[PDB]
Subunit: 153 residues, 3 copies
């Protein structure tokens, strides 16, 4: 257990928290961004205010978060949750194992989901679409419409 006078803490062979208020726990775990936190062997939180939790996880974007083995978040404001998830667009969010949020301000929801269009939320990919269930009827213009509502027309 190695500590610094600037709030860094590390543990594991070759683990290095050098950014200030850093935490790096795991073999060759690295937290080089300010306010950065890395957990798992070869985890890498190099972005400022980044968080990389999971073996070979990586969060190199500013304000990025990658959680799950081999998860990646290279976009600024990008967040990836799930083993092998990638959030690579600016302000993107990938939630699901092997999900990919590639476009800016996009989200990909579910395992293997891909978001390749700006400002959109993807629940799968072409030929692998998912039904959205337990949706209460929409009220405002920008609420989703459910089947009971479509049928009422």
């Amino acid at each position: 257990v190695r500590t610094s006078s600037l709030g860094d803490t590390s543990a594991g062979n070759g683990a290095n928290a050098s950014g200030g208020n850093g935490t790096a726990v795991g073999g060759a775990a690295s937290a080089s961004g300010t306010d950065a936190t890395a957990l798992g062997q070869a985890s890498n939180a190099s972005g400022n205010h980044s968080t990389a939790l999971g073996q070979a996880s990586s969060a190199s974007g500013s304000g990025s978060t990658a959680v799950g083995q081999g998860a990646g978040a290279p976009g600024d404001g990008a967040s990836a949750f799930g083993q092998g998830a990638l959030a690579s667009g600016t302000d993107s969010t990938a939630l699901g194992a092997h999900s990919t949020a590639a476009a800016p301000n996009s989200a990909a929801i579910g395992a293997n989901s891909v978001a390749s269009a700006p400002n959109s939320v993807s629940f799968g990919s072409r030929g692998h679409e998912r039904r959205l269930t337990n949706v209460a009827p929409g009220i405002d213009g920008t609420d989703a419409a459910n089947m009971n509502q479509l049928w009422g027309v």
Copy 2:
């Protein structure tokens, strides 16, 4: 590495797991709730069964989870994922950097999304709506309708 007979583990300058089965790792990391887990400098898992992971992350609600630097989950049953995400409503869920789910039983999906109505899931905020894609056609009454179904009705 400090350990107690009651399942607590602490590592870091001033790191303190004191709640029973606590784990606190990072400078001034604090796990004071029962079964609490805190990782990162100044991380604070103070709710019973809370989990705060990331620098300055905070999970003070009972059963709360905050993952991401500066993430916060002060609501009971609340879960926040993303840097600066905030799940402040009871049973709220905020998934995306700087997302906010303030209302009870709500969810905010995507960066900067705001959920301020109860029992609702927001995919953005007013003037910043997001489109929902790769949606299979709705089958049951409470499923979403897609554009293909809307077009077949416009006939």
Copy 3:
């Protein structure tokens, strides 16, 4: 802090990382899968490429991730976020406290949400539906229709 020549790290009474590139931190924390990461007392990352973070969390599925106190991911490709969240279906994703993504290829979004139909995404459960808000109008056949669009047909 114990370390192996095969990249394992463990800290805590009875902590054990034995799979290769493993990390196990906390009282009786266990990381037995390859490339596995466990944080918290009794946390258990026994799947290959699994990640279990939170007191008593479990990720026993291959490539599974469980984050939150008592969160569970026994399914292959399963990801659970939130206290007591369970993603048990193959390729399922449970996001929210006490959410359950049970069916293969399903997702449960929101506290207490249940997904029991394959290839579907649930925002609640029967009699506990949630409104989806801040949805831009759909463009492609497989985009969700919003209310403005529905009303544009109604006339």
